[PDB]
């Protein structure tokens, strides 16, 4: 019911609520998928009670009792999502050998820069699609000059960064001259 969005009535008004540690990714690699699918919803309901309390503390202009509780649950929800995705990725390499779950390809855009194109789901082949064929995946010769100008811009930045670091180190010996070794 709607009583699961709030904390134990007795805890209302308290400034501290003791809480345990956050689930670690290694402690979840021992549980089964059915147990992880059940735990996801146990943490989900605890996360919504903490988001509801965090918003009502701002409404009443008071500090949240134990903000770390929300950080712990978020870390546990991310660790659990890492384990499941890890098992699915490994299972995909064995049956298929693919490293990515979503298809894609390397292509040049109209601007001439390399980009990874993530495919979409369609009902008709690509040679019949009106909107897909209006999109261009090739750069014309009027782009070469801008590609060089953009490459030279990155080189200037990288040169100032490297020369600056050398300066700091040369100025770092004037005050600490025992760093010669």
Partner RNA sequence: GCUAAACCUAGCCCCAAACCCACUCCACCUUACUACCAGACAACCUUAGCCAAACCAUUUACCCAAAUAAAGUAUAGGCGAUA
Partner RNA sequence: GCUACCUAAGAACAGCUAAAAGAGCACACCCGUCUAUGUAGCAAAAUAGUGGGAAGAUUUAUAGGUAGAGGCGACAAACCUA
Partner RNA sequence: CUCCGCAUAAGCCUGCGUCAGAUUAAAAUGAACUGACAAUUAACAGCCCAAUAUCUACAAUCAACCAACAAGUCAUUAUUACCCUCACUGUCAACCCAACACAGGCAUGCUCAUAAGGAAAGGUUAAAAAAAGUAAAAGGAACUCGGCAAAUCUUACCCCG
Question: Residue holding tokens 């009583």?
Answer: 3
Closest distance of CB 146 from RNA, Å: 14
For other proteins, which is the closer residue by CB, 21 or 180? 21
The Cα 133–Cα 91 span in angstroms is: 35
Q: Which two tokens stand for residue 180?
A: 């010669």
For RNA, which is the closer residue by CB, 18 or 102? 102
Q: Which does 27 bind (CB under 5 to 8 A by kind): RNA, other proteins, none?
A: other proteins
Give the list of residues 6+ apart from residue 5 with CB closer than 8 angstroms, or none.
48, 49, 52
141 lies in the binding site for RNA (CB under 7 A)? yes
Report residue 65: phi and psi, to 5°: -60, -60
Q: Which does 170 bind (CB under 5 to 8 A by kind): other proteins, RNA, none?
A: none
Q: Dihedral angle at the C-alpha atoms of 73, 75, 80, 86, nearest 10 degrees?
A: 170
Residue 50, burial from CB neighbour count under 10 angstroms (0-12, 13-18, 19+) = buried
168 lies in the binding site for RNA (CB under 7 A)? yes
Q: Which does 126 bind (CB under 5 to 8 A by kind): RNA, other proteins, none?
A: other proteins
For RNA, which is the closer residue by CB, 96 or 121? 121
Rg (CA), the chain: 27
Q: Site residues (CB under 7 A) for RNA?
A: 55, 58-59, 61, 102, 109-110, 114, 116, 118, 120-124, 127-131, 133-137, 140-141, 151, 154-156, 158-164, 167-168
């Amino acid at each position: 019911g709607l009583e699961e969005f709030f904390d134990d009535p007795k805890n209302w008004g308290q400034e501290k609520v003791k809480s345990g540690a956050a689930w670690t990714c290694q402690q979840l690699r021992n549980k089964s998928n059915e147990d992880l699918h059940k735990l996801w919803y146990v943490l989900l309901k605890e996360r919504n009670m903490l988001l509801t309390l965090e918003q009502e503390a701002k409404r009443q202009r008071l500090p949240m009792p134990s903000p770390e509780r929300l950080d712990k649950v978020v870390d546990s929800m991310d660790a659990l999502d890492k384990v499941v995705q890890e098992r699915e990725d490994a299972l995909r390499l064995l049956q298929t050998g693919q490293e990515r779950a979503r298809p894609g390809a390397w292509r040049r855009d109209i601007f001439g820069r390399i980009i990874w194109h993530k495919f979409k789901q369609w009902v008709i082949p690509w040679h019949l699609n009106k909107r897909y064929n209006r999109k261009r995946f090739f750069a014309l010769p009027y782009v070469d000059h801008f590609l060089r100008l953009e490459r030279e811009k990155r080189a200037r930045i990288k040169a100032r960064k490297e020369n600056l670091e050398r300066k700091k180190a040369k100025i770092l010996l004037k005050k600490f001259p025992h760093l010669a070794e």
